Design a protein around this ligand. Structure first.
Ligand code: A1CYD
Ligand code: ZN
Ligand code: ZN
Ligand code: ZN
Ligand code: ZN
Lengths: 69, 77
């Protein structure tokens, strides 16, 4: 039904939001510290000196284990 | 259809996985450090001395800004 389509859309948007903002191919699993933006996969996060969202200096990258992984 | 119910179930399980494992009422937004388990809201994470998943001691809690977060602001109309 049209309801099935609406639910398909919500699921797709949630899935897209889980992907890395830099490569768009891998699941997010890293956090920039101390700002806390959690927007990249480990490979893309490892290469950044500053946060791609807020420009704060990245002191370190913390790997995150999320229940949605 | 039955597929509408299946999709409703998948969406419900994904939404439940985004809620705090301790209170079940607020979105996850905190990481236990150093273990890295990101399973609580800020209120439950502040009260735990050890991680509820792996029992590693919590040295500090890091707030996380996730692209999936929602608030009362996201309400339609
Ligand atoms: C709000 C929340 C709790 S767990 C989760 N998973 C979706 C994430 C966003 C970053 C990678 O997937 N979101
Ligand atoms: Zn990436
Ligand atoms: Zn940032
Ligand atoms: Zn909680
Ligand atoms: Zn842990």
């Amino acid at each position: 039904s049209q309801q099935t389509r609406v639910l398909q859309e919500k699921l797709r948007k949630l899935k897209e939001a889980m992907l890395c903002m830099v490569c768009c191919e891998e699941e997010i699993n890293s956090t920039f510290c101390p700002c806390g933006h959690t927007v990249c996969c480990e490979s893309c996060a490892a290469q950044l000196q500053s946060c791609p969202v807020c420009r704060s200096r990245v002191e370190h990258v913390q790997h995150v284990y999320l229940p949605t992984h």
